[PDB]
RNA sequence: CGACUCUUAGCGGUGGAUCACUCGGCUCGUGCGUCGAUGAAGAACGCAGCUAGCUGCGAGAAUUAAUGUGAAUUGCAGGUUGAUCAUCGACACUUCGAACGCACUUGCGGCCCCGGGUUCCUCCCGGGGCUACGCCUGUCUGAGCGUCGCU
RNA sequence: GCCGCGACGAGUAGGAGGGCCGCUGCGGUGAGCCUUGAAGCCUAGGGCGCGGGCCCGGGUGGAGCCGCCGCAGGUGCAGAUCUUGGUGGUAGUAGCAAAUAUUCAAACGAGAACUUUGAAGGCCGAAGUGGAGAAGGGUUCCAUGUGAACAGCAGUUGAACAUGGGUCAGUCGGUCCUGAGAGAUGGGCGAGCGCCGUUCCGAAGGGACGGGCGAUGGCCUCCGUUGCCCUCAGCCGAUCGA
RNA sequence: AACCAUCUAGUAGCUGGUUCCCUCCAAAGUUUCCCUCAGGAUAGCUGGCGCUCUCCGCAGUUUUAUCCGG
RNA sequence: AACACGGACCAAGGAGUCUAACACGUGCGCGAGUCGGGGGCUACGAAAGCCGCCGUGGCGCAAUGAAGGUGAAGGCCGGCGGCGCGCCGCCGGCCGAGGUGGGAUCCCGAGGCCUUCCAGUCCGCCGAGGGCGCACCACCGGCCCGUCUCGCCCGC
RNA sequence: CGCGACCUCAGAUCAGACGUGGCGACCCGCUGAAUUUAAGCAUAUUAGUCAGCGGAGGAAAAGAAACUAACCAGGAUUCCCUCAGUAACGGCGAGUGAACAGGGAAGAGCCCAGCGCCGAAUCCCCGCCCCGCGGCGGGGCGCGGGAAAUGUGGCGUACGGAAGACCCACUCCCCGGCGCCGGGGGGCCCAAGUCCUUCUGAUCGAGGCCCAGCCCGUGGACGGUGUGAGGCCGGUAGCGGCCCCCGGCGCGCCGGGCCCGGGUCUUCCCGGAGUCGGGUUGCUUGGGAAUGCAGCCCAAAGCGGGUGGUAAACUCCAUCUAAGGCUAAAUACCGGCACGAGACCGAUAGUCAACAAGUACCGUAAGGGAAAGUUGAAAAGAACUUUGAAGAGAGAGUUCAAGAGGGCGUGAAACCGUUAAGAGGUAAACGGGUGGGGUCCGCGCAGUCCGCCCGGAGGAUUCAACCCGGCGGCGCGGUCCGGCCGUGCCGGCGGGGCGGAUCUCCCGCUCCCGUCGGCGGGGGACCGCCCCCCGGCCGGC
């Protein structure tokens, strides 16, 4: 049961936020999974995607073990178009489809400055979260 | 509100013009105009009666009634039929009023707790309760109570010691202080046989809170035990007695049906 | 058997009831409980690469700076020493409006200062800064066979 | 609860009882049902109940629903010259009748009684079916293209639609003036937002020329540019109003 | 005796309408008073809830006595 | 049926409600008492629980009278004081809170309810006749407050 | 005459300042209706209400007695409960209608004038200099300028007070700054399966994970995601973490001001006028020989005045000190910002409006004021061929499905077309009773098994009785051994916990002459009730 009596537990006002949210939250809202070699790695559990990422579809039509590379990012529809992940409309002219982040699983992080910084500071909150509770 | 409906201003046309003689809406080319306005029956209008907010919600009772029915529920949380009859599942439960030991009050996490109710067979019914979690039926969908299950257990303490923390997580339990304890939820639907588990200061504290019948309650000012009006209840033990039998007349228990009127005109040995 | 008329069922049409969905209401409650001559409220007119409305905005005109965030917006073209979103203390805010130079025609003005205009002739032109009513404390200049003083 | 005996049964206005009659929602409860297809809907199928109504089969449909014990209600429609929304007969009917009128060929075009040109015949007959303006409308003006909808038949057309263009003043008007009058100030009245009243109980001029004295600016020549003092000044009522 | 909104869902002894089943019982239009006669009260008629006794009392009836009647 | 009115057809909507007070009936709690509703202490809960030196107060337990006020059995023996054997009043002792009729239930119980004929106890059951009488009704007395008439005494 | 003091009144685009309108849910002061009720109506009622006008705040207003009472007396205001539908008013009809005392929330008190003391001991502004400066202040210096005797400041105000003298005892408060240690706003973070099978277009479904009963749980609220998810993501829990800003109490120090008291005895001092009050008129109030308010007229007092709910005269008593002022807390809030919930409503409902709504549109104007939601998981929106001027269609084609093709979910009746069937001169339509034909169903179309018996034919390592082992039921085991209890009862050299309107020396405290009483408390006995220990009776399991 959630105590706190500001936050809200009422259905329209989550679609609300939700289907009414800002750029910079719905940056946050469309994260995505690491695969265990890389939790072992990182020790970190889940991370922000980004456009540059390699990735594993595991539900729907094309699902398997091909290893994709991003293409782009549509926030405005929370969903991403992957490179080979596509179908041919009549004419011919190919169509990337929508996926939705959380049907995605990370293999190979696009490694820039912030990421590793947002990693050490996702692994230091781990750090004091067990030491404290132990 | 009261002001729903008539905010419009609206003259009747009257008599002639062959129309039925009602508020109608004050000119102007667009279609709300003869339009009808007021009225249960017209389009938009007043609905009958409006609601109040000055209706008597609240209904008090009084005290002594209440705390007969806590005695009663009470009574019923030892017979066993009755908690089955609400469905709790206890079989190798070895005693309903089940009393353990105080040093519960010293859990601190859920692990430890649930293997305790695993220890004392008592899964059972959240297994129930786990299986039963399902939707409601209705308009009550869109106003968040979407999800329904079957009431569990109850648990009393007398002093939280982390208790409360460390049981909350689990599915139905309602924890209780015996000093205020509550009617609404160890009866619910007004229907007898919650499943309880007592702890052993809470145990004890009943005589002192509700005293027997031949000492009053020491805590509320002036209060003892419900009287019975009878006590051998059990009637089939006493109607076979030696003394009522005794003094009995004898039972005419023979069914004599209807005869059939045969003419004695016609029938000889009639 | 014909055509016509009546009745029922299958199928197709008109029309949009019912049922299921719900980023809206109503009601109750909590905590705060702030506008304006430093030009408010309201109205008008404008502003987008393709834009009419809705929404946002004031000649810096769908936004500047600063701070936080940390790589997009997207219907279509095109161009990480911080793109984009939010926060908002600096920066700015056209014209009517109590409305304030006098009028409501958007017409007339008045004073002072700059630059072209002179060749100080002052004209002519542009720009800039002032120019509402009432009332208060003080400043200044005045009035009165009002009341005195000296002559 | 079950069972046995007798006697009776019309009913408006009206009263009372029982409703495993039915609707919407709340606490318990059915280890209830459901994408191997819920609700709703359709049905010359099979059945139950005196009846209110209900249960099975079949078809359609694509996500939620019901039984039992208790509680609360905005809880059951044929009518109200009821409300809103939709559809019939009446009807392919009444009708498309104010002021004389059209006809022949040719062209584009898929197609022409009505478009255009030419030819022929008629009318309005300068108190005009003409040429120009005002108030008032506000892009309807002009060209190119379009042929959905509109122009009560049609249309290759149009004041319809879509794209684009277009209004140049010292001298033409407003702007200036006052007109019947409206309307400030002073003054008065008024609980008060405000009102009477327009020369009436008002210290109602900021102007000018010359003289003197002071003050600056210039080929300081001569003349400007501000100030005081002397001398002079009737207005009339601020202001709008063609 | 204009027009717009509000007081305003303004009053009506007067017309009009008023949503499921079955079962059981079942009327009045007469008295008196009212600026009462298209209306109320009030007695009357009706239902429902019961209660005290029953396995001596009562009757829209006659008879026998006895009065009354114009 | 009407030469009385409303109705072309269909779907959906559409009408004795809420609040206060009172009266009667019923169910429940406690009982000469009863009630905390206001106030205070202690996710669902704005609930729930407690308070009695928080029963102030409300309703009831006494009426009547305009008001000052007043306020709900009595009977009998001896004595003492006084008067026409008796009486009034004043001191000590006993019974002490009405009566009649009708009254559902209870009580007494002459006698008796069968084995072979008598003798012979205990337990039941029935019952002639007679009593104590609940509730309730009818009547009769008594008591209380106001009021009227007639009276004679006690007290500081 | 001229010059100079003052007084009174003007003008200035004088230097510096302030007002002016909006919002108006709640508040304050005025003015002020009628519908209607009374079965009519006219006074009353509706009602000091709607409508009009002005002025405010986060609250306002109120408020420290010209009081209540008439008891053994209480003691500012505001608000709740009760006093109460009471006393009273009223064509005595209809109806209207308070207060004081009592228990509660909160609880805080103060200031001038006057009368009088003090070299006006007072104030504002300019100028100059130093510090500080996003709430314009602190300090020093001017023959710098005004205000002010038509009265500035200190003390002090009805609870009395001062001056004077005489005794006793005193030392910390106020203003602003700096640095150092410990609520509010904003930002970023934190557990655990996509494990193995299966249906399906897509799975959040179903089944499974053994004795470490899948993993976490201080986290199983909720939302999203191609159906229905504790464990896929965001969040939720936690005296969990980190980073900024603002505040909050403390400490150490600087520059200034303030130099005040407690009692005693003696002498003096002390109150607010066109106001109270009266007559009179009109409104209002429960206030009735006038409760309040106002207008006119009259017009006062000082051992005085007002009040003491029936006018008046006489009379004693009681209680207050008006006619100058301030003042936070509890209380109110259908407007606003930003937040939370619901046995509410589900597109003819709910605000008029779930949407480009106060929009389109109407009226010269004041004002009036609508209709209108829904493809799909995914735009995959139908390339290509073919007839036709094209609209329109035919094949092919996406999708699980176009039996969802841009006003497109499901798609009833009224109404129409066609098809199939049956019939037809007393308009159609109906109840009862039968017949015929259709329609589909009966999964009909050689028809019941059940016990028991009799008889003939198979087969299984099988029946009874005893032994062993376990368990349950019962026990007149007449009365086997031991417990446990009793809304049962007696005994107590018991130990006590509550209550008592039954009694009871000591202690603590004030007063009187180490002595004598009183009040409060406390042991100390005494009565009732229960609980724990024994012993014994009765009865049960
Ligand atoms: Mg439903
Ligand atoms: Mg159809
Ligand atoms: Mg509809
Ligand atoms: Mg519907
Ligand atoms: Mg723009
Ligand atoms: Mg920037
Ligand atoms: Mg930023
Ligand atoms: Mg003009
Ligand atoms: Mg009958
Ligand atoms: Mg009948
Ligand atoms: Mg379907
Ligand atoms: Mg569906
Ligand atoms: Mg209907
Ligand atoms: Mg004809
Ligand atoms: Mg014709
Ligand atoms: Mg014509
Ligand atoms: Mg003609
Ligand atoms: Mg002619
Ligand atoms: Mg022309
Ligand atoms: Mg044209
Ligand atoms: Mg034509
Ligand atoms: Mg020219
Ligand atoms: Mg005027
Ligand atoms: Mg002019
Ligand atoms: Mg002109
Ligand atoms: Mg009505
Ligand atoms: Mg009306
Ligand atoms: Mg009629
Ligand atoms: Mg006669
Ligand atoms: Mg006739
Ligand atoms: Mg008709
Ligand atoms: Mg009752
Ligand atoms: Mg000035
Ligand atoms: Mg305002
Ligand atoms: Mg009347
Ligand atoms: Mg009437
Ligand atoms: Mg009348
Ligand atoms: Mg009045
Ligand atoms: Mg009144
Ligand atoms: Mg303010
Ligand atoms: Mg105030
Ligand atoms: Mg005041
Ligand atoms: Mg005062
Ligand atoms: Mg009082
Ligand atoms: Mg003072
Ligand atoms: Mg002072
Ligand atoms: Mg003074
Ligand atoms: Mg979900
Ligand atoms: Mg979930
Ligand atoms: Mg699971
Ligand atoms: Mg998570
Ligand atoms: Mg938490
Ligand atoms: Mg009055
Ligand atoms: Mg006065
Ligand atoms: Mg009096
Ligand atoms: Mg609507
Ligand atoms: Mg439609
Ligand atoms: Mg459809
Ligand atoms: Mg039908
Ligand atoms: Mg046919």
Request: net charge positive; glycine share 8%; aromatic share 6%.
């Amino acid at each position: 049961m959630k105590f706190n009596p500001f936050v809200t537990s009422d259905r329209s006002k989550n679609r609300k936020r939700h289907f009414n949210a800002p750029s910079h939250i719905r940056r946050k809202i469309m994260s995505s999974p690491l695969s265990k070699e890389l939790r072992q790695k990182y020790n970190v559990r889940s991370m922000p995607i980004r456009k540059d990422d390699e990735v594993q579809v595991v539900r729907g039509h094309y699902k398997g073990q091909q290893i994709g590379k991003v293409v782009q990012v549509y926030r405005k529809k929370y969903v991403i178009y992957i490179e080979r992940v596509q179908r041919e409309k009549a004419n011919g002219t190919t169509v990337h489809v929508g996926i939705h982040p959380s049907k995605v699983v990370i293999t190979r992080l696009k490694l820039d400055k912030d990421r590793k910084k947002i990693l050490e500071r996702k692994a230091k909150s781990r750090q004091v979260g067990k030491e404290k509770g132990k | 509100s009261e002001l729903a409906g008539h905010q419009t201003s609206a003259e009747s046309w009257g008599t002639g013009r062959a129309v039925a003689r009602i508020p109608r809406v004050r000119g102007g080319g667009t279609h709300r105009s003869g339009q009808g306005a007021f009225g249960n029956m017209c389009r938009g209008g007043r609905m009958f009666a409006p609601t109040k907010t000055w209706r008597r919600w609240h209904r008090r009772v009084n005290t002594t009634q209440k705390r007969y029915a806590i005695c009663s529920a009470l009574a019923a949380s030892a017979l066993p039929a009755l908690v089955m009859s609400k469905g709790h599942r206890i079989e190798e439960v070895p005693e309903l009023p089940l009393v353990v030991e105080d040093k519960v009050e010293g859990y601190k996490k859920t692990k430890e707790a649930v293997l305790l109710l695993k220890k004392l067979k008592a899964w059972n019914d959240i297994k129930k309760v786990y299986a039963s979690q399902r939707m409601r039926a209705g308009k009550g969908k869109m106003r968040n109570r979407r999800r329904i299950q079957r009431r569990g257990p109850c648990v009393i303490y007398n002093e939280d010691n982390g208790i409360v923390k460390a049981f909350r997580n689990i599915p139905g339990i309602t924890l209780l202080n015996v000093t205020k304890l509550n009617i609404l939820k160890l009866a619910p639907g007004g229907h007898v046989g919650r499943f309880c588990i007592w702890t052993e200061s809470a145990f004890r504290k009943l005589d002192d809170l509700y005293g027997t019948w031949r000492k009053a309650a020491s805590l509320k000012s002036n209060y003892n035990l419900p009287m019975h009006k009878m006590l051998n209840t059990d009637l089939s033990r006493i109607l076979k007695s030696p003394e009522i039998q005794r003094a009995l007349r004898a039972p005419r228990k023979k069914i004599h049906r209807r005869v059939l009127k045969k003419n004695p005109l016609k029938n000889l040995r009639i």
